Design a protein around this ligand. Sequence first.
Ligand code: YNS
Length: 123
Amino acid sequence: MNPPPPETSNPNKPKRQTNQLQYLLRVVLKTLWKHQFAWPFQQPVDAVKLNLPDYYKIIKTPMDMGTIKKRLENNYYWNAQECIQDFNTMFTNCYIYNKPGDDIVLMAEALEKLFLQKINELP
Ligand SMILES: Cc1cc(C)cc(Nc2cccc(-c3c(C)nnn3C3CCN(C(=N)N)CC3)n2)c1
């Protein structure tokens, strides 16, 4: 079964809007979203759909770009580093669950390099 997806709202959490967070949504997230390798990462891993009973047995801090996008739209984050950490968790989860050379790992490796390129242009 699927655990609940990561929260995208938390009324007691303190929140911020910064120019860097705006850029993370407008440029980083929305450009990576359009990449030809982005599709596996656009929503939480659905272990029922994918017949993956051990995905959430192995991955304890799941993360995906749909969650990140919703978090940015809801101003969920305090700073850009907190959002950047979610991207890094998404990529590392993919390496943890899969194997070197797998198609999904090649996709994450390409997306991670593009992500780092865009982070260098943070205002
Ligand atoms: C057979 C296949 C290959 C590929 C490249 C993608 C898919 N579809 C999707 C859709 C949404 C998320 C994922 C995903 C993420 C994120 N992280 N891992 N995955 C899977 C886990 C199981 N898996 C395996 N080889 N046991 C493949 C990679 N994959 C299915």
